[PDB]
Amino acid sequence: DEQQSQAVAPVYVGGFLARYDQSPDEARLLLPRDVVEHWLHAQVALPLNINHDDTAVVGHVAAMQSVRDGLFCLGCVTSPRFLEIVRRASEKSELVSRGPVSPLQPDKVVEFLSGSYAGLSLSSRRTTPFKHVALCSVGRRRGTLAVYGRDPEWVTQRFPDLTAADRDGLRAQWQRGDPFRSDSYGLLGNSVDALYIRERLPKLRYDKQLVGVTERESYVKA
Amino acid sequence: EQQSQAVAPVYVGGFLARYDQSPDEARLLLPRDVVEHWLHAQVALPLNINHDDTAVVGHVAAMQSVRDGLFCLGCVTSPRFLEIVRRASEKSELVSRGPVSPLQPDKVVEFLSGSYAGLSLSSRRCDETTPFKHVALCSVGRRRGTLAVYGRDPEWVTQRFPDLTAADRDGLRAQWQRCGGDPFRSDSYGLLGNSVDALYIRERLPKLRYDKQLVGVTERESYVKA
Amino acid sequence: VDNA
Amino acid sequence: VDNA
């Protein structure tokens, strides 16, 4: 049962909330580096929720950094209740049972998050421009793949676009009870919703490549 | 109250196989000759989630080989499973959008519709007399035309398929009427875990839109979400 | 057995 | 607000 104490330990998630080189198929999704940098300048830690549900908060956004190709953020899933649900549910996922690739070690909880919420979705105004980052099955903004991992550093190095300078900025930030007022049922219901998102896998692949995570080893099930 | 009737039995129907369709693997072959012999060979078949022996949620009430394929009528009875479903249905924006045209919302029937949009038989590998093992609700069966129509009433369900002739409904009705604790040994964590597995089945919606068009449920009105 |  |  000691195998569960580390299984329910914090999990980091990283990815781009927006890609400047991607034209939104909807104006409301436009978000150029200029706005981002002013906003980042204008404004505790933004909450991390499940599919934008304000009751399914699982952690916080540890770092936000505008970089060459977009706004990249790094979050931390810290809800014991949530991490616990994910643990129980991972034991029952065939996908999780197929384990990870190359020489990675199976991490049921991580692999599970990787699969359910392969996308990141920023919530901001059309002061506090940035409201919250959301974990989801796919973001309406392209290139928003969610990379989960037990180590911040490790997670950040899964993205080829980032440079040592970038990592310093993010590292500096991330280095500086229980907000999950939902349950397994709420999660179950939300998943059925995801099965009907049109072109879920296609965009998820498009995202994996565009962000160059295709080129590395990670727990991305996408 | 409205919950009491929400967790009431739910019927499910559809083809377990379609004779006009040639499977993609020779191990999915199941022609009318075999089906009818097996039927005459064979206690009702359990009804489980994704072939999970611990996730049995009911039983198959009627089985009948008809012109276009093997059709089965089933009934989800497990109070535990139904309750889990009820809870989740309140948290599904898909279920919140409601049903089509003049159908009345049924959060639960609608949820089962959206999660287990398919039927998957479990029979002996064609290559002593209990050929069929069970029927499984799933996100998409491997055999095409296997769309799953959920409903609160058997007649209403069988009445969703244009292929079925009044005579076929009589064979089924004869069955499900004569047919008449909680077999479920799983929980919400299981279903949830089982749900991620479905997010990674290639072409889930295309196969379902196909199954819906082929079996004519595209033509009528139902709680089908595909 | 075959499961579909 | 807009949510992605």
Structural domain boundaries of chain B?
A: 1-226
Contact status of B131 with chain C (Cβ, < 8 Å): no
* Residue B224: C-alpha distances to residues A38, A186, A196, B64, B66 (Å): 47, 21, 12, 22, 22
CA distance B42 to B30: 16
Of the candidates B206, B116, B221, B200, which has an alpha carbon nearest to the alpha carbon of residue A94?
B200
C2, containing H or E segment:
strand C2-3
Residue position matching structure tokens 């049962």: A1
Cβ-nearest to A188 among B195, B197, B199 = B195
Q: Give the pairing type, strands C2-3 and A70-77.
A: unpaired
Cα radius of gyration rounded to whole Å, chain C: 4
Cα dihedral A4, B184, B203, A192 in deg (nearest 10): -70
Asked if A134's CB is within 8 angstroms of D2's CB, the reply is no
The residue type found at D3 is N
List the structure tokens of A217. 């080893």
In A30-178 the beta strands, taken as DSSP E runs, fall at 47-50, 53-67, 70-77, 119-124, 130-136, 147-149
Asked if B115's CB is within 8 angstroms of A192's CB, the reply is yes
Beta bridge partners of B91: none
To one decimal, the resolution in angstroms is 2.6
Class of domain A1-222: alpha beta
* Residue A109: C-alpha distances to residues A146, B100, B167 (Å): 14, 38, 52
Residue position matching structure tokens 């994704």: B50
CA distance B200 to A51: 18
List the structure tokens of A99. 């384990």
Residues 6+ apart with CB under 8 A from A102: A217
Annotated active-site residue A41? The verdict is no
Q: How many residues does chain D have?
A: 4
Asked if B133's CB is within 8 angstroms of C2's CB, the reply is no
Beta bridge partners of A12: A76, A149
Beta bridge partners of A75: A13, A61
Q: Which chains touch B (3 or more CB pairs under 8 A)?
A: A, C
Report the 10 Å Cβ neighbour count for A85.
27
Kindly tell me the burial class for residue B8, based on how many C-beta atoms sit within 10 Å of its own C-beta (0-12, 13-18, 19 or more). Answer: middle
Residues B80, B63 contacting (CB under 8 angstroms): no
Q: Is the dihedral of CA B179, B182, B187, B193 positive or negative?
A: negative
Cβ-nearest to C3 among B17, B122, B126 = B122
Q: Is the dihedral of CA A7, A112, B143, B134 positive or negative?
A: positive
**C-alpha triplet B215, B219, B225: angle, nearest 5°:** 80
CA distance B157 to B171: 14
- CATH 3.20.16.10 assigned to domain B1-226? The reply is yes
Q: Which residue of the set A79, A90, A121, A137 is catalytic?
A: A121
Residues of B serving a catalytic function are: 51, 120, 134
Beta bridge partners of B65: B70
Q: Is the dihedral of CA A78, A80, A83, A87 positive or negative?
A: positive
Residues A193, B92 contacting (CB under 8 angstroms): yes
Cα radius of gyration rounded to whole Å, chain B: 16
Report the structure determination method. Answer: X-ray
Q: Return the residue in B21, B119, B122 with the most chain C beta carbons within 10 A, the one to mutate for interface testing.
A: B122
